[PDB]
A paper describes a structure:
Choline-O-sulfatase (COSe; EC 3.1.6.6) is a member of the alkaline phosphatase (AP) superfamily, and its natural function is to hydrolyze choline-O-sulfate into choline and sulfate. Choline-O-sulfatase (COSe; EC 3.1.6.6) is responsible for the first step of this pathway, consisting of the breakdown of COS into choline. This enzyme belongs to the S1 family of sulfatases (subfamily 12) according to the SulfAtlas database. Like other arylsulfatases and phosphonate monoester hydrolases, SmeCOse is a mononuclear metalloenzyme. DLS experiments performed at pH 8.0 show a single peak in the particle-size distribution by intensity, with a hydrodynamic radius of 5.7 ± 2.1 nm, which corresponds to a globular protein size of 200 kDa, also supporting a tetrameric quaternary arrangement.
The COSe from S. meliloti CECT4857 used in this work presents a single L105F mutation with respect to that protein (Genbank Accession No. QAT12853). WT SmeCOSe crystals alone or co-crystallized with choline were grown in 1.0 M Li2SO4, 0.1 M Tris pH 7.0, whereas the HEPES-bound C54S SmeCOSe structure was obtained from crystals obtained using 1.5 M Li2SO4, 0.1 M HEPES pH 7.5; they belonged to space group C121. The largest shift of Tyr123 occurs in the HEPES-bound structure and might be attributed to the bulkier piperazine ring compared with the methyl groups of choline. Lys102 is also displaced, but only in the HEPES-bound C54S structure.
Residue numbers in the entry:
A (entry chain A): 2 to 514
B (entry chain B): 4 to 515
C (entry chain C): 4 to 514
D (entry chain D): 4 to 512
The structure:
């Protein structure tokens, strides 16, 4: 029975989850997300499943780990037969739509979404394929580099602001269109994903929002740059992949990058308020669950690192909030995962556990919201640029454990060491630290065959090097999504009942005052 | 110096009808003429007796268990290299006119250009369900209505399709010939993939009239009663709804007659393509390959269509002619799996570049007289199976295994009609040793329990996704050819001083 | 021709729970049935979010600044006319069963008869002091111990009280029906004033079990940290000793579950009253009014109880059914101040008789489709205030002023949970013009310096007087219902022949 | 070590009869012996010439305009502090035997215990109406029938009342004496408030016979005819319905004779209280205050009763005797407004605890030789007024104002009988300057138009309320004294061997 709630998923890109200690941090100018946070169940220790765009987003859609989706990097094909939350909801009777980006690679640019309002900002082809056969070599034309840090600043239009302006406009327009069915008893409930590209770099913001942070006290990272020689091996691979030696990052560069990033959160907050105002005025808010989420974090100069690709807090933590009918507001400290979003959504929509159990590696967060302890650990994977073999991580209780066949292990006690400055795998405090390291090693072997993981990643890369080079010979066939809204069926046309058209398009109906 | 490549593919052509080129009784002058100048692989097999699995496997030179295209509704991943990718990577312009039954949103799988849509769906509709053994889906399963409905018409769904496939292929050849005189041209590879002689068995009168005196309108083995059929054959008859059709001897003769007529319909189209190649002066530089995806039992044993490993269903013709190809008849068993490595080899691509991507072998050494020893493998995991089946063809033997069924072993030299199952009725110790050798070879190649679990998981995925995709507004995956009218023929942004010259070929007396 | 009037009043009922009658999720069949035949005032506000100021203002139809009942220990002058006086003057028998939190020696204030004592004290104990801003008083201030102590019990102080209130109210209706056949009978007005769902949040198991599957056991806005609270909310949070209590999520759920249970408890008593009216054949001649004195935040924003102008605290239900009342839902804001002139109007009293004595307006024109334009006014001047607060509700707007605090402006159609203070954070030019207009409206209704000086003098008087009165033998003011035993039932001075007939009703019937 | 306080209050006693204690011609041996040991305030005034306004003002030490008790039916709010409150706060036991004419449901106003009900109503019955000037309410207004009905009787409504008032007040002193030998005993303050010599002018024959040859049975200023009266006096004459009585010279003499007799009746009762204090050994530790609510014209000028600011109506006696009180006569005008701050001063209460609550001053400084300069203010806003009246008494002067009447100014030294109105015809520039001085002082003290509006609002409220309150079953506010018999005398839950000793006092051989 369709007493089912509507679902508005607001997503943003590259949002460091530590900036949401309990809703947005006090220092951020974000009135609309703070007001949303007060009505929300808030998951303080929520993690991405993979600190990179396409792997995190394919994993997010399916509620499955990259090792199961096979979307290892930003150029890996996402099979159209993999069930996503759009399939699960659509099968249960929802209209499903996406406005904005999801970095799906391959010719399927919908993956269950019934309608998609924008193209993607990023490529949909196999261009950005890493190569495990050439460790230490970087592809300068698509790899991250620190020019974002040295080029931060102020502008009134950017590639990303043109995208997000449009993402927001078409999202609010779709809500307005949906509200015209509000009185139809046979209406399908709806689930709209609004997926913004900010605050992803470039770190460039409109002057109105940049000015908000003139007096900002958080423009210096809380852990300074660690010299290359003192970095752990993965961090060294990242600084090399970012071409760090060819940039002189000053203190001012760091301050301007962080200022523009905070400004772009404030830019998004204005868009969040627009969406909620639309919901309020179309009389749809009380029946609508609102979920706020992100794909991965951004180190923001902490430890001298920028962007993502690692499991340190700033990169792996992303915010997660849920508000609406039946959701108790509150703060939750138990680690949760992006992998839990899809089963959480299925549960909120009234779908049985048995229908989604075969298709997800996460757990519904609804029992948490209703006072049931969650015990499952949080699992993460990374297998893209700046790795030479896959890395996996486990987050459970107060611990984070990181393994890569090529590197010394890492173990962090986040209650005693929230900034992850003391590796206990190498400097154990006592026998408990050693017993803990042993138990995580066994957990690691219970979840991953790291040799098979490496081999599968190498085969996936190898396929695409053959295929992508072929596809770039001769005439190119693009896979980018092209939204179509048929002009011949919109607004007023002479095959329609014109004395009924205006009433159909009007909502609310029959009112004055 | 790289040759052009024309691939002529037909659908559902029983390979037993090409004993040495087309059988004598077929009216097929153009294919018999092409055969005389071809290397002919008399004992060539499909890799899977079903359209999409055979075609995905044909395109990749990989077995269905590797492509994952188990049935007619299984997604074919776009990251899987095909002979299109391999040729295109080597510098070929590649194009497809006709069908390939690709399932999923990629309708090119490496082809640079595709001139027609597919005749069949590109979505997950036709998914079998191993969880419901014994039922059928009436709205897409085969049924014997094609046998009782055979006859004569001047247009059909398939004749509209194939008429269009032919026109656009000859037009593309004409278009390509305009680049003949430019030394920096790319060589081209054009696949022309017709839907005939696949059923419905309905032919144009012109071609139905050619077989009025035909002496092959009776199958060579008669209908085997259901109680005497091996279990898989029983499953095929149930899936075809055999009990609700009263197939008469006249139904059988008419179906076979129209089927032979449609081969002659195709033969005319082969002559058109050869004629285009001749008059455009590209024939001498063009390799010509003739192939099919699977066969058709055509009433033999009482069976119709495909879905099994018997000769009529699993045999398909294969020939290659052109520059550097010595003609002759080859008898060692070969596979559609070999087509992709054979193409790459003919195009000068190194064996090492294709080795990691193909389970077949190049046939070019065979064309040049080299003995072959590699066996021929086949798989089936779609409708009328309740669990996967596999077959091995080696020397004179064929072995067929399904976990649920008695094994089958045939000696095709002593028993070309596979009337004696030597697994059940061995002639002596050598047949017993042979069975054991094939058992061991099967176990080293397939884990049939892992195979069955992979097929089940693939079916279950699609049951969830397809039901969702059929809710709300449908988003189609069918390929839409686009030829930009604003850039064709005469337009006022173009150099009209040079347009006519560039579109004229050959450029003889009067041309610039 | 004058109709009977039954006023059903409950205590601390959050008006947001009555969007259109009781909300669907409440188990309240009797109040849902009453609502369906009622004029229902969706946006009805208390005039002061505290028990005694709200109740004295309700009785008089006058704001606290006029009644002088500023807090829960402020004397209510017996010379102030109430709806009981107005009706009694027009020929009504008037009676109260239940509480009214009247402070001072007059415990009737016009009621001709009162069937129970009060549940609360009648003296000057609970007196605030503006000369000591920042202190709290633990032996009478609200504290969060009600939240941590919520649960289930088969008797409580409040359930003993309300069981008696209900029994005597139904008994009185039965007594009154014996005069139905007399043409010269006075019409009656009976006020039944229950103490639930006021805390303690403790309910009978039977009603507790109704809400096991409830989806509203948590509030729509969570606890806002002290540092982010507006200053009045901060004063309140200190006032309930919020830091001395560890309020778990389960405490929140148990508290709201028992509160909902006690509404269902009340719903059963509403049905008994209606059933008595039905069987005595007085239903068709009786106006029924359902009301409350103030709301309860119930954990929203982290706040419990009242003392503020936020919706959960200031909104209270108001419903009217009966002869001459067209049913319907009304969204224009209305006020408890309006009940007294509404009642007098329904009783045939002229507007001129009541105009000099009321700050509200009759709602009868609303019921009959006539637009109401007067704003809704509210005041607070008790504990957790350091100076009086006033509020104005008009159109979609709510404006709150206190001379010690930043102003608050809410657009309730855009922001029904009041999460954006538009005085600090206007959305545009119209928010600003609207702020200026409310400031002008405020200066037109209130002299805030005179308000504060009158509150301070009243507090100081009582501090001198109460100290004295708690020395020596105490003289209590609690109402004691009259004793009539020698004139009740069968006594040998009466006529034992007509006695049974007089006490019987209906009379001379069979079937 | 705080003293006991006995307040003896009488009703309607003309203060001019106490020129230095009681006048010689009165038979009042006990009040004269008391006067001799008393500080005596010869020129003491009521704050309002009417029962309930005077008594509410007496208790609060606040003017009627501040108490809001404007007339004999105006509610007295229980939140207004009274001298009972102040003394109770300071550790005193406080009690009242007799009348106080408190209107409203509070019949204690801080008294811890009250031994009798009131002789007068406690409800809003006697409410005037400024909207109907010139009319009168015959069922409770004063009328001259008291003057024509004067005589002799052995029991009256008032003698029954005052006999019981006296008996319960002496019993209470006995009960209090049992606590004498207890160190932790609270000090006590007992107010004994008699209804005499208020009219009816009817006395017991014993006391009536004491004035056979009395030489003061003729008023010192005869009747003034209506058309020669000041307009307020005219309003009073109509309110008493004067033209419906033939008041003879005999009626005047009879009324004044019965009035003087009832002073003697009261004097006997004062002797009883004093004797009870003496024999219980509480006397030396007890302050004794003698006072009255308002006066009585007693025929002077042809007027009777009160309601005006003339000397006979506005003067009331005031005396204080006891520990720490130097005897002597004081001539500076004082006011009933001063009793409450005087009591609080005598009880050791600091001046700051009481100053925000009183419009009067402590008289203890005068008793001890400190000159007092504050003026004496009075107000009247009840029957026979159509708008409020105020008066200022300072030095030798009395100024009387009502917006609707000509002003009155009197020099009481040159003109003790108030026969020459210096506002209408002054003696010279000094008189004129004086009138101007008072006009300005009055304007600084009262807005008379705000006064009139508050009186009207109070009347209007009560007209709505009192009508309702008199429909249906009536709920009375009259005080019912408490007396648990189950806890009195000898009961079988107490220690009987111990009961007799604790109820016995003094406790010697
Ligand atoms: Ca991204
Ligand atoms: Ca096919
Ligand atoms: Ca209350």
């Amino acid at each position: 029975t369709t007493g089912k709630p509507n679902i508005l998923i607001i997503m943003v890109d590259q949002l460091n989850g530590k900036l949401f200690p309990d809703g947005p941090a006090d220092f951020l100018h974000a009135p609309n997300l703070k007001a949303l946070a007060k009505r929300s169940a808030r998951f303080h220790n929520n993690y991405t499943s993979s600190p990179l765009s396409a792997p995190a987003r394919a994993s997010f859609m399916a509620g499955q780990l990259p090792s199961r989706t096979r979307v290892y990097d930003n150029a890996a094909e996402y099979q159209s037969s993999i069930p996503t939350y759009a399939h699960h909801l659509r099968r249960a009777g929802y209209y499903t739509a996406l406005s904005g980006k999801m970095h799906l690679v391959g010719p399927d640019q919908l993956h269950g979404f019934e309608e998609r309002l924008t193209t993607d900002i990023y490529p949909a082809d196999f261009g950005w394929t890493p190569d495990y056969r050439k460790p230490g070599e970087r592809i300068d034309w698509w790899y991250h580099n620190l020019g974002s840090v040295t080029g931060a600043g102020v502008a009134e239009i950017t590639n990303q602001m043109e995208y997000d302006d449009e993402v927001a406009f078409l999202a609010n327009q779709k809500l307005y269109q949906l509200s015209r069915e509000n009185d139809d008893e046979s209406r399908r409930p709806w689930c709209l994903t609004v997926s913004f590209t900010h605050p992803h770099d470039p770190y460039v913001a409109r002057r109105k929002f940049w000015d908000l942070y003139e007096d900002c006290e958080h423009l210096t990272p809380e852990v300074g740059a660690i010299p290359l020689d003192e970095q752990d091996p993965h961090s060294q691979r990242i600084m090399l992949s970012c071409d760090y030696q060819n940039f002189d990052v000053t203190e001012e560069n760091v301050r301007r990058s962080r200022r523009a990033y905070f400004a772009n959160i404030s830019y998004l907050d204005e868009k969040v308020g627009e969406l909620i105002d639309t919901l309020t005025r179309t009389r749809m808010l009380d029946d609508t669950l609102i979920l706020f989420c992100s794909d991965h974090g951004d180190m923001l100069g902490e430890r001298g690192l920028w962007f993502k690709m690692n499991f340190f807090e700033g990169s792996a933590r992303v915010p997660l909030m849920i508000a609406g009918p039946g959701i108790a507001p509150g703060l939750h400290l138990t680690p949760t995962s992006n992998l839990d979003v899809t089963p959480t959504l299925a549960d909120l929509a009234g779908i049985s556990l048995e229908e989604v159990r075969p298709w997800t590696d996460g757990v519904s967060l609804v029992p948490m919201v209703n006072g049931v302890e969650r015990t499952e650990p949080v699992l993460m994977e990374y297998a893209a640029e700046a790795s030479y073999a896959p890395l996996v991580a486990i987050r459970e209780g107060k611990w984070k454990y990181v393994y890569c066949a090529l590197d010394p292990e890492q173990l962090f006690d986040l209650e005693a060491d929230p900034l992850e400055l003391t590796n206990l795998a190498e400097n154990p405090r006592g026998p408990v630290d050693q017993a803990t390291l042993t138990a995580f090693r066994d957990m690691r072997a219970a979840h991953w065959d790291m040799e098979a993981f490496d081999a599968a990643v190498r085969e996936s890369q190898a396929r695409r090097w053959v295929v992508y080079e072929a596809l770039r010979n001769g005439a190119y066939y693009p896979w980018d999504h092209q939204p179509l809204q048929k002009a011949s069926e919109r607004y007023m046309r002479n095959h329609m009942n014109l004395d009924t058209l205006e009433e159909s398009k009007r909502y609310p109906r029959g009112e004055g005052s």
